[PDB]
Every structure is written in C-alpha cells, then in structure tokens.
Design an enzyme around this catalytic site. Structure first.
Site, PDB file in Angstrom:
ATOM      1  N   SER B 146      45.417  42.066  40.722  1.00 13.22           N
ATOM      2  CA  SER B 146      44.008  41.749  40.994  1.00 13.22           C
ATOM      3  C   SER B 146      43.217  42.013  39.715  1.00 13.22           C
ATOM      4  O   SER B 146      43.623  41.529  38.647  1.00 13.22           O
ATOM      5  CB  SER B 146      43.559  42.539  42.220  1.00 13.22           C
ATOM      6  OG  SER B 146      42.173  42.377  42.457  1.00 13.22           O
ATOM      7  N   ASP B 201      46.302  33.598  48.978  1.00 10.89           N
ATOM      8  CA  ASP B 201      45.502  34.717  48.493  1.00 10.89           C
ATOM      9  C   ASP B 201      44.169  34.214  47.957  1.00 10.89           C
ATOM     10  O   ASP B 201      44.115  33.241  47.200  1.00 10.89           O
ATOM     11  CB  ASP B 201      46.275  35.462  47.402  1.00 10.89           C
ATOM     12  CG  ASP B 201      45.499  36.630  46.805  1.00 10.89           C
ATOM     13  OD1 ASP B 201      44.363  36.912  47.238  1.00 10.89           O
ATOM     14  OD2 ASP B 201      46.043  37.272  45.884  1.00 10.89           O
ATOM     15  N   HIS B 258      46.650  38.884  49.840  1.00 15.10           N
ATOM     16  CA  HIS B 258      46.374  39.504  48.553  1.00 15.10           C
ATOM     17  C   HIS B 258      47.133  40.810  48.365  1.00 15.10           C
ATOM     18  O   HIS B 258      47.349  41.227  47.221  1.00 15.10           O
ATOM     19  CB  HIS B 258      44.872  39.756  48.413  1.00 15.10           C
ATOM     20  CG  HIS B 258      44.477  40.320  47.087  1.00 15.10           C
ATOM     21  ND1 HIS B 258      44.827  39.724  45.894  1.00 15.10           N
ATOM     22  CD2 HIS B 258      43.770  41.427  46.762  1.00 15.10           C
ATOM     23  CE1 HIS B 258      44.348  40.438  44.892  1.00 15.10           C
ATOM     24  NE2 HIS B 258      43.703  41.478  45.391  1.00 15.10           N
TER      25      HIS B 258
HETATM   26  C1  LIG Z   1      35.203  41.063  54.121  1.00 16.89           C
HETATM   27  C2  LIG Z   1      36.502  41.871  54.125  1.00 16.89           C
HETATM   28  C3  LIG Z   1      36.477  42.978  53.082  1.00 16.89           C
HETATM   29  C4  LIG Z   1      36.778  42.471  51.675  1.00 16.89           C
HETATM   30  C5  LIG Z   1      36.220  43.388  50.592  1.00 16.89           C
HETATM   31  C6  LIG Z   1      34.685  43.357  50.529  1.00 16.89           C
HETATM   32  C7  LIG Z   1      34.069  44.687  50.065  1.00 16.89           C
HETATM   33  C8  LIG Z   1      34.896  45.394  48.973  1.00 16.89           C
HETATM   34  C9  LIG Z   1      34.250  46.730  48.498  1.00 16.89           C
HETATM   35  C10 LIG Z   1      35.275  47.891  48.409  1.00 16.89           C
HETATM   36  C11 LIG Z   1      36.745  47.381  48.408  1.00 16.89           C
HETATM   37  C12 LIG Z   1      37.771  48.498  48.131  1.00 16.89           C
HETATM   38  C13 LIG Z   1      39.096  47.943  47.554  1.00 16.89           C
HETATM   39  C14 LIG Z   1      39.890  47.116  48.572  1.00 16.89           C
HETATM   40  C15 LIG Z   1      40.967  46.224  47.882  1.00 16.89           C
HETATM   41  C16 LIG Z   1      41.501  45.103  48.823  1.00 16.89           C
HETATM   42  C17 LIG Z   1      40.390  44.511  49.700  1.00 16.89           C
HETATM   43  C18 LIG Z   1      39.557  43.462  48.943  1.00 16.89           C
HETATM   44  C19 LIG Z   1      39.668  42.069  49.574  1.00 16.89           C
HETATM   45  C20 LIG Z   1      38.697  41.072  48.930  1.00 16.89           C
HETATM   46  C21 LIG Z   1      38.810  41.072  47.386  1.00 16.89           C
HETATM   47  C22 LIG Z   1      37.835  40.076  46.743  1.00 16.89           C
HETATM   48  C23 LIG Z   1      38.246  39.682  45.307  1.00 16.89           C
HETATM   49  C24 LIG Z   1      38.437  40.890  44.372  1.00 16.89           C
HETATM   50  C25 LIG Z   1      37.915  40.587  42.954  1.00 16.89           C
HETATM   51  O1  LIG Z   1      38.567  40.843  42.013  1.00 16.89           O
HETATM   52  O2  LIG Z   1      36.625  39.980  42.784  1.00 16.89           O
HETATM   53  C26 LIG Z   1      36.665  38.740  42.098  1.00 16.89           C
HETATM   54  C27 LIG Z   1      35.369  38.595  41.282  1.00 16.89           C
HETATM   55  O3  LIG Z   1      35.544  37.578  40.328  1.00 16.89           O
HETATM   56  C28 LIG Z   1      34.148  38.243  42.167  1.00 16.89           C
HETATM   57  O4  LIG Z   1      34.072  36.843  42.310  1.00 16.89           O
HETATM   58  C29 LIG Z   1      32.851  36.404  42.854  1.00 16.89           C
HETATM   59  O5  LIG Z   1      32.286  35.448  42.384  1.00 16.89           O
HETATM   60  C30 LIG Z   1      32.238  37.145  44.046  1.00 16.89           C
HETATM   61  C31 LIG Z   1      32.668  36.521  45.376  1.00 16.89           C
HETATM   62  C32 LIG Z   1      32.352  37.424  46.570  1.00 16.89           C
HETATM   63  C33 LIG Z   1      32.960  36.864  47.857  1.00 16.89           C
HETATM   64  C34 LIG Z   1      32.755  35.346  47.961  1.00 16.89           C
HETATM   65  C35 LIG Z   1      33.132  34.809  49.344  1.00 16.89           C
HETATM   66  C36 LIG Z   1      34.395  33.937  49.296  1.00 16.89           C
HETATM   67  C37 LIG Z   1      34.056  32.439  49.111  1.00 16.89           C
HETATM   68  C38 LIG Z   1      34.745  31.547  50.174  1.00 16.89           C
HETATM   69  C39 LIG Z   1      34.301  31.902  51.621  1.00 16.89           C
HETATM   70  C40 LIG Z   1      35.473  31.829  52.621  1.00 16.89           C
HETATM   71  C41 LIG Z   1      35.471  30.508  53.419  1.00 16.89           C
HETATM   72  C42 LIG Z   1      36.593  29.568  52.988  1.00 16.89           C
HETATM   73  C43 LIG Z   1      36.919  28.527  54.057  1.00 16.89           C
HETATM   74  C44 LIG Z   1      36.726  27.095  53.559  1.00 16.89           C
HETATM   75  C45 LIG Z   1      37.552  26.093  54.350  1.00 16.89           C
HETATM   76  C46 LIG Z   1      36.708  25.328  55.365  1.00 16.89           C
HETATM   77  C1  LIG Z   2      41.539  43.436  43.063  1.00 15.82           C
HETATM   78  O1  LIG Z   2      40.306  43.278  42.853  1.00 15.82           O
HETATM   79  C2  LIG Z   2      42.018  44.615  43.909  1.00 15.82           C
HETATM   80  C3  LIG Z   2      41.730  44.334  45.382  1.00 15.82           C
HETATM   81  C4  LIG Z   2      42.650  45.190  46.249  1.00 15.82           C
HETATM   82  C5  LIG Z   2      41.890  46.425  46.728  1.00 15.82           C
HETATM   83  C6  LIG Z   2      42.870  47.593  46.816  1.00 15.82           C
HETATM   84  C7  LIG Z   2      43.756  47.418  48.047  1.00 15.82           C
HETATM   85  C8  LIG Z   2      43.101  48.110  49.240  1.00 15.82           C
END
Ligand SMILES: CCCCCCCCCCCCCCCCCCCCCCCCC(=O)OC[C@@H](O)COC(=O)CCCCCCCCCCCCCCCCC
Ligand SMILES: *C(=O)CCCCCCC
Ligand SMILES: CCCCCCCCCCCCCCCCCCCCCCCCC(=O)OC[C@@H](O)COC(=O)CCCCCCCCCCCCCCCCC
Ligand SMILES: CCCCCCCCCCCCCCCCCCCCCCCCC(=O)OC[C@@H](O)COC(=O)CCCCCCCCCCCCCCCCC
Ligand SMILES: CC(=O)N[C@@H]1[C@@H](O)[C@H](O)[C@@H](CO)O[C@H]1O
Ligand SMILES: CC(=O)N[C@@H]1[C@@H](O)[C@H](O)[C@@H](CO)O[C@H]1O
Ligand SMILES: *[C@@H]1O[C@H](CO)[C@@H](O)[C@H](O)[C@H]1NC(C)=O
Ligand SMILES: *C(=O)CCCCCCC
Ligand SMILES: [Ca+2]
Ligand SMILES: [Ca+2]
Ligand SMILES: [Ca+2]
Lengths: 269, 269, 269
Positions: B146, B201, B258
């Site tokens: 990531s 992913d 992912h």
């Molecule tokens: C919503 C579920 C939770 C996800 C995480 C959100 C909050 C995270 C904060 C703390 C996280 C702690 C660490 C956890 C690590 C694993 C969990 C993370 C999972 C998400 C990771 C994101 C990328 C990481 C990452 O590295 O970030 C990438 C960075 O370049 C940000 O890029 C952006 O421009 C920001 C985008 C934000 C989200 C945009 C929404 C998605 C767009 C598409 C919508 C979906 C619909 C599609 C369907 C279409 C078909 C009809």
């Molecule tokens: C990349 O941005 C890392 C996203 C994974 C979060 C850690 C796994 C819970």
C-alpha cells in the site's frame, strides 16, 4: 456568479479554514504570525495576521482552532478545525437532535456540534469580545471547514445580537439542525451566513433529511471540479430551504470533492 | 502464470512488507532478529535476517519501516510500512502532483509520497550504501504494501543508477505520479519494478486517472480470491501503461482484497 | 414480540454496553458510580452501579471496558467496549480462523477477537470470580456492542462451566467463528446468549459467510428503524443456525442502524 469582492472573501476564509488544520496553528504562542505548510494559506501569510488565541483538545469533542487578528483586512477571525482526531469523528456520529431553546424555540441541533460548542462557549465568547473591545473598528468572522464550519455556524447563531455583527463562512459544512433551526439561520440578523458547497461533496448531504435535518438558505455552490481553480463565475447562489439543484442533488456523492474548496483543505499537517 | 522462482520472491517480499506493520519491528535494536506475530512472516523468520535500522515517526508523514540484512537469501531489504497512523492518512490525501525533475524530466509525483521520501532519503541512502559496500554480493530490494509500496517505488526510482541494482516489490500500491513518471518507471534501468495487485483491490485504483495519475507497466495481477492460497498459475503479467483487464477494471472495488497478498498484509499489531 | 421482562433486560444491558464507550468509565476508581454523558445510560445511573474494575488498552487489540457491581438488580456486569481505536480496528481485520479447541472441540474463531480475549482472560477471570465469591447470589452478565459483543460472546463461552451461570447480551456483534463454534454457542450449558441485531445493520453480516463464518442461534431482531424508540412488539426471535429473514437478509446493509440499539450506542466520549 458572485462579485469579485465576495469571491475574494470566499477565497480568503477558505484559507483561514485550511490553516486551522495545521498542527502548529493549534498551540501557537499569542502574537506570533499565522503560517501554513504546502502553500495552504498564502493570502493569510501575506496579511499581517497573528494569533490572539490558539486552542486544541478543548471542551468535549476535541474542539480545535485559533482566534486571529488580521490588521491588513481589519478582521477578528475565529477559525475552527474540521475532523482530524478520532474524538472529532465520534462527535460527528452523535447525530440525534437536541433542543436548543436558548437559541430559538422549536429549534433542534446536532447533539455533537451543539455539545462541543457549549463546552467552549464561555471561554471563546470572552476571547472574541476582548478583541472587539481592543479593535472595535474590525469585523468579526467565524469560519471553518466541515465540522469546523458546523461549529462556526452554531457559534455565530449563539453569539449574535450582542452589539457586533458576526459573519460566518462555512465550507462543506454538514446540516446542523432541524427545519426550525434552518429557518432561523436563514432569517437571523446581526451578521450574514455564507454556506459554501462544492459540486457533489457528500458532507453537506449529512446527516440525511430522513433523520429530521434541513439546510439553511442561501447556498453558494462551486460548480468547478476537484483540482480545478475557482473563479467568481463558478459559484452559484441558490435560495430556498432544503433547495435542490446545488449540492443537494439525487446523484452519486463524492469524497475527494470535500477536500477542494478553492484549494486543498483538511490536508495541512 | 509466472515461474516458481519469481513466485517465491513475490511471496518472500510480501512477508517482508507484512513485517513492517508489526510495531515491534519499528523500534528494535540493531542486530536483533526480525520476527512477526502469528504467521505473518514465517519465511522471514526462517531466514537469518536481522535489523540494520528500525525506524518510526520519521520525517514527514510518519515514515515507518526497517532496513534488514538477510544472510540466508543474501539480501539488503528496505521495507516501508503502509498506512496505519492518522499522520500516514493525512499524507495520503496530499494528492496534488509536485515536480520531481531531479528524478526524471517532466515527471510529477504524489505530493505526500514524494515529500515523505524526500524527508528521509539522505538518512536511508547512506545506510543502504553502507550495507552495499560491506556486502557487495547481496541484492538490494525495496518493498512495501500500500503506501509502503508507493514509498518503495519512489525511493527506488530516486536512488537507482549509483552502481548497484535496486529491485522493487510493491503490493497493492497506489498510483504515484503522472504519465511521464509512469513511463520512466517502466523503462528505467538498474533494477526491476514488480508492481503486484490482487483481484479488485481498490488502492491500486487510487488516485483516479482523472486527477492525472498513471500506472507503470507491467502489472502482476493475482486472480485468486481472498483467503485463497496463491499458486504461480494465479498470477498474470499485464503489459501496457494504464492497461486494463487486470486490477484496472470498471467493476466494483473491494477492501478485504487489499489485505490478502499471498497472506494477510497490514494486520500485524 | 418478546416479554416485557426480557425487553427490560435488553434495554438495560444496551446501556451497560453504551457506558463502556465513555472514556471516564475505562479508568475510574473502584467503588465510584457508573455514569455516562447525555442520556447514554440513564438506567445504569439510576441503579446502584459502581466500578469493581475498569481497564483500557489491555492485552492485544486495545481491550477496554469495566466490571460493575449492580446492587439494585443484583448483577455482576462485565461490559466490553466496541471499536473506537485504530488498534481496535486492526484487530477486527485479523479475520482468518484460528483453532479454539480449548473452548470447544472442532471450533475455530476470529483470530483478532480470540487473541484479544486470551490476552486478558486470566486477569478478568480472577476479577469476575472474586466478585462471585463476594456476592454469590448475584447474576453474572457479560455484555457489549459490536466488537464488545464479540469479546463478551467469546469470554462467556470460555469461562462457563466453573460453578456459575454467565448470561451474554450482545448488540450488533459480528460473526465470531465457524459453524462448530456457532453450534456450541447455541447449546452450551451454564448461561444464555442473547444475540441482538437491528434491522439491516452491516456488522452482524461480517465476516461474510464465504470466509467460513456462521452465526449462533437464536437471533433477536429489532425491526423498528434508526432513531425510532423500540417497544417489545418490535423484537422478533429467530431460531436456526445462520437463519435468514432477520438481519441476515440479501438486501442493502446500513451503517447508521449499527449505532441505534434502543438508543445511540458507540458515541459516548
Ligand atoms: C470505509 C471503510 C474503511 C476504509 C478506511 C477509511 C478510513 C481510514 C482511516 C484509518 C485506517 C487505518 C489503517 C487501515 C488499513 C486498511 C484499511 C484501509 C482500506 C481503505 C484504504 C484506502 C486507500 C489507502 C491509500 O493509500 O490512500 C490512497 C490515496 O492516494 C488517497 O487517494 C484519494 O484520492 C482519496 C480517496 C478517498 C476514498 C475515495 C472513495 C473511493 C472512490 C470510488 C467509490 C466506490 C464506488 C465504486 C463503484 C463503481 C461501480 C458502479
Ligand atoms: C495502505 O495505505 C495501507 C492500508 C492498509 C491498512 C492497514 C491494514 C489494517
Ligand atoms: C479527514 C477526512 C477525510 C474525508 C472523509 C469524509 C468522511 C465523511 C463522513 C463523515 C463526515 C463527518 C461529519 O462532519 O458529518 C458526518 C455526520 O454528520 C453523519 O453522521 C451520520 O449520520 C452517519 C454517516 C456515516 C456515513 C455513511 C453514509 C450514509 C449514511 C446515511 C445512511 C442512510 C440512513 C438510512 C438508515
Ligand atoms: C471509526 C472509530 C469508531 C467507529 C465508527 C465507524 C463504525 C462503522 C462500522 C461499519 C464499518 C465497516 C466495518 C465495521 C464493523 C465493526 C467490526 O467489529 O468489524 C467486524 C469485522 O469482522 C469486519 O471484518 C472485515 O471483514 C472487514 C470488512 C471491511 C468493510 C468496510 C465497510 C465500511 C464502508 C465500505 C463500503 C463498501 C465498499 C465500497 C463498495 C462500493 C460498491 C459500489
Ligand atoms: C533472541 C533470539 O531468538 N535470537 C536468535 C537465536 O536464538 C538464533 O539461534 C539465531 C538464528 O538465526 O537468531 C537469533
Ligand atoms: C453521587 C455519589 O457520589 N454517590 C451516590 C450516592 O449519593 C447515592 O445515594 C447512591 C444511590 O445509588 O449512588 C451513589
Ligand atoms: C510576522 O509578521 C509581522 C509583519 O506582518 C512581523 O511581526 C514580522 O515580520 C513577522 N514575525 C516573525 C517572527 O516571523
Ligand atoms: C469534517 O468532518 C471533514 C473532515 C475534513 C477533511 C480533512 C482532510 C481529508
Ligand atoms: Ca504575515
Ligand atoms: Ca531468524
Ligand atoms: Ca448510580
């Protein structure tokens, strides 16, 4: 379309809102200059702007921001930070409607936002009115992005009517109360509320109408896309309680649109 | 399909990328073993792998990881941790494109990723090159999952061309720059970039193309499902800048996908 | 429909679960009252409920909650906090199945939940059984919301059969193990498990069936909507391992429903 003058104010206070996110702007010593990182607030740096008060982890819900003195633009600016901490996000989720009879009868507000403001009202009211005493020629402006805009809106409603006008500039602010509160925010005097939205930003659509929330009027809607510069012709004034055709449209919301209000906002370290 | 030799490398460095999330591997004393919790990195534990440098809260954006010396596989492994902290996440959102002409002409890279690397490049280069001098028969490998995969890619492109090859293994990494950069990463000499992805992913689909981001070629696309063991027949090489049919398809993205790259990645406490 | 007595139990332990989120209830002196903020646990406050043991950041996964002495209802209540911290969320994402043969034969449980309980099992068993000895006529009850309900479900299954009954009241809990563990949780002697779900809350649908997870029987399904008061006529008992027609339906899930279990849960600061 808005006037070039109003566009300049929209641009300026978006940068004051952006500055509230920078960590160094939440524990800065009084009298020091307000600066940002990554070109987040150039217009604020150009100005003779200093800290009157800098706060973080205040009250309940981690209220954070600063009170600024702008000698160039002759402003007293109270800028609230939006959501960054876990405590901020949890406060956002306290979305049940609570009576705010001390603001208007029949009005109800987001429990979280109103509780957070109540917890810092006495302190900040004193800081603002001290500044008005020292600089009575200046103009009082509350501003904030996202949660910070919701706080600036509630605070303005609560402190207006005490001899000085309070203008509010919110950017991507969520709905803050029921329709009674939305109508009050629309007709209250003692200052103007400029509620600025961007395209299909999701946050101004929260909490959903079905939970009893409504938006005040008018709306200033930025039609230019994310990462696209904004001109005065890209902003549309939209009148009407819970008016549709601006950010409140039945289309797919967008998260990155929430971070582009004239520039990147919410991303200053 | 890929060769068994390449499959073994893909699995090994997927576990080096997992070890970087384990908190104990970010502040360990030099010379001690690299271990993980559970079965997060059994192949790393089986090797005679020790810490050359363990770091956390480094530079801007909370750069976190370790530099490892692997006497069993004869490797010098620089492994970046992915996103975990709030600071990691604020950096991910600084997705404006910044100039990186020192790396390649007309290239632009994600502001956060390139600013995080730039803040630690002097310290880490020196340590990498010290190890290369002492162990010229060892292979230098940058890797990460990531955000960590994005940092490994940038660091690799920045330090290559100084006498020793640098191979990069990135897992579920987002786009890091513009087309100029994506082409440079495709043809750059002095090492090979193995950009690995898993089914649908979401992260390799960020930031969206519309913001000016592209993906280097080729892509190694894992087709097997989540919690499904990977065989060398489940991995497909996909050539072409911004090629589709791999992870880059117009379907619904997935979050648990992912976290499954040969095993669970990102979940080590 | 459920009886008014059971409904009252469902309502009381929903507020004990809600209380576990309040930060002040995770580091309180023993013997002091249990209180919450803004009507989060009015029934708990009315009762003569005092702290026997409050814990935070315990074991692995940031195990948090309190052990309460309720003299009004003659209860020993172990309340686990749900998800709030990053450490909590990382633990939730450790969703591969791990052998819990020591609890029941052939059983396999969520790796994060079981590791979190094992890391505090000896400390909390001693605290519970000390309280039992001191008040051998009180009723032992484990409870929690979301992650807290999963910990309460695993703790009760582990500690039953040592001379006292343990009743468990979970709210919006996810699936905790495979089918063997789901059957055991359905039939185990020495206490009852009340697994409570709300409309189309997403969390009781996680982890998905396809990862090898099953839900115990029965299910008490709240049919009233979000921000809508619950009456005993809105709760329906549903029997059968992995039964459908309750929360487990092939319709669109919802996130806000997760926070409304008789009242707002998960939002106490
Ligand atoms: C919503 C579920 C939770 C996800 C995480 C959100 C909050 C995270 C904060 C703390 C996280 C702690 C660490 C956890 C690590 C694993 C969990 C993370 C999972 C998400 C990771 C994101 C990328 C990481 C990452 O590295 O970030 C990438 C960075 O370049 C940000 O890029 C952006 O421009 C920001 C985008 C934000 C989200 C945009 C929404 C998605 C767009 C598409 C919508 C979906 C619909 C599609 C369907 C279409 C078909 C009809
Ligand atoms: C990349 O941005 C890392 C996203 C994974 C979060 C850690 C796994 C819970
Ligand atoms: C750093 C910030 C990164 C950008 C991410 C912005 C995240 C926006 C979401 C919270 C914003 C905080 C914020 O300021 O306001 C959010 C808060 O008012 C909304 O509270 C809620 O009611 C829950 C919303 C959860 C999101 C789920 C989407 C749909 C919710 C409604 C479902 C329909 C109801 C039917 C039942
Ligand atoms: C944050 C701190 C306080 C909590 C406040 C937020 C709580 C919200 C709960 C809901 C979040 C999901 C998991 C929480 C369960 C708690 C919890 O206890 O976790 C249960 C755990 O077993 C779940 O494990 C998993 O399998 C991870 C699944 C990740 C799902 C994330 C969904 C969130 C929103 C994403 C929407 C879908 C993706 C886009 C689809 C596009 C289609 C076109
Ligand atoms: C504390 C510890 O386990 N140190 C180990 C040692 O026991 C082992 O013999 C050696 C083999 O790589 O690696 C190191
Ligand atoms: C408020 C306080 O410090 N202690 C109270 C006490 O006054 C009250 O009589 C008792 C009844 O439940 O609960 C406890
Ligand atoms: C801050 O700016 C003002 C002028 O606007 C002046 O006090 C000085 O140049 C600056 N001070 C510092 C410490 O940068
Ligand atoms: C307010 O709750 C919105 C959060 C501000 C966004 C910060 C940068 C993503
Ligand atoms: Ca200045
Ligand atoms: Ca070893
Ligand atoms: Ca009491």
């Amino acid at each position: 379309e808005v006037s070039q003058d109003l566009f300049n104010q929209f641009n300026l206070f978006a940068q004051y809102s952006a500055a509230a996110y920078c960590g160094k702007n939440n524990d800065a010593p009084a009298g020091t200059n307000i600066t940002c990182t990554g070109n987040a607030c150039p217009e604020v740096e150009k100005a003779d702007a200093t800290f009157l008060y800098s706060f973080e982890d205040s009250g309940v819900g981690d209220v954070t921001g600063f009170l600024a003195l702008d000698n160039t633009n002759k402003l007293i600016v109270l800028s609230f930070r939006g959501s960054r901490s876990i405590e901020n996000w949890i406060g956002n989720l306290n979305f049940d409607l609570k009576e705010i009879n001390d603001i208007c009868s029949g009005c109800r507000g987001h429990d979280g936002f109103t509780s957070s403001w109540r917890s810092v009202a006495d302190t900040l009211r004193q800081k603002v009115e001290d500044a008005v005493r020292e600089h009575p020629d200046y103009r009082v402006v509350f501003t904030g992005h996202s949660l910070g805009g919701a706080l600036a809106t509630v605070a303005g409603a609560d402190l207006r009517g005490n001899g000085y006008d309070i203008d509010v500039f919110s950017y991507g602010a969520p709905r803050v109360g029921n329709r009674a509160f939305a109508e009050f925010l629309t007709v209250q005097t003692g200052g103007t509320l400029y509620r600025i939205t961007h395209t299909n930003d999701i946050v101004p659509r929260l909490p959903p109408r079905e939970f009893g929330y409504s938006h005040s009027s008018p709306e200033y809607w930025i039609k230019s896309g994310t990462l696209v510069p904004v001109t005065r012709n890209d902003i549309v004034k939209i009148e009407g309680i819970d008016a549709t055709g601006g950010n409140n449209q039945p289309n797919i919301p967008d998260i990155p649109a929430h971070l582009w209000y004239f520039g990147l906002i919410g991303t200053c370290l």
